[PDB]
């Protein structure tokens, strides 16, 4: 019954069996119980601050080829873009004036700043006195190696599928496996280590998502981003439908539930494709949200929401946005780094 999963969600009873099908019930209440109880656990283990990631989209160049994606190599479309090492520090600077405690340095695999120009900005932003986080792909063990001594707290390497087959057959430069090690090599060499997945990929299943689900908790990821599918009109699935927000949100729910002490984000699909939908996603099991914080001209001062679109005056609007969100929600701005406190074992 609905009734009963839900209880053996509590005695954390997490089995196939029970995934499974409480990934498969869509009735309402089910749906609003399981969300109230993570956002319980959310509450009780992670507390009631809202943790601030002020992303720096710093280059949009890619090596690799992914279907899904925007950025991917076979993309003509797209202007390329490289911000200079100075522009990104300063940028950073600009961050941490406007409060930001964590610094996110993302981009598409691009060689360029590979890994002396990382580490030598890293470094300079630790001057800061902020977390570090990046989010720059697969690379050898040695790069990761570089950059954690070079200061670097976090990293995010999203697994997006766990189901090998469709990981290749979407990211035909790689695998699952290498992706499996990229993470394993993060976690042992100390990075606070962020995986996760899209939901509603042409081709998955629930079975897949459970999967994902006992994926993360089998290796226990600091952070876990989730968001639906959403197709990118540049690629080879632009014709694809949408990963759907109740289905995703689930995830989420379940991954805090999985993953109780874990950081997990809001991610800005969500936003994209419900309105509220990231507002949503942090009274169900969310805590954290990153900002866009890359400047113009690399980021239109237009961010598409559905029915509005929010035309920003400035490079810069969006981190008093989301503290004015965090104030509205009734939650707290963090006090300190926020990065993941592991608590709930031993
Ligand atoms: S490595 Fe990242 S940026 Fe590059 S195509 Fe794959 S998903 Fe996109
Ligand atoms: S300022 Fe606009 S784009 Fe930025 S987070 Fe707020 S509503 Fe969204
Ligand atoms: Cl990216
Ligand atoms: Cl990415
Ligand atoms: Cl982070
Ligand atoms: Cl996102
Ligand atoms: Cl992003
Ligand atoms: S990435």
New binding site residues.
Partial sequence: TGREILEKLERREFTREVLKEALSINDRGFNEALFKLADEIRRKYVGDEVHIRAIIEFSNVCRKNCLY?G?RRDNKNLKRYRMTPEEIVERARLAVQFGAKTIVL???EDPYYMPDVISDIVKEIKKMGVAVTL?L?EWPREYYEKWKEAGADRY?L?HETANPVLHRKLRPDTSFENRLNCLLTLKELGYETGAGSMVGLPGQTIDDLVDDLLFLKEHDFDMVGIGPFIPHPDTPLANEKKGDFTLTLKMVALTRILLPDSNIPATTAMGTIVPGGREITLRCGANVIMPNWTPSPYRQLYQLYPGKICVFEKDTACIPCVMKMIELLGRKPGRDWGGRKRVFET
Avoid: F, P
Wanted: charged share 10%.
């Fill in positions: 994606c950025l993302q981009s598409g989010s792909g995010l999203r």
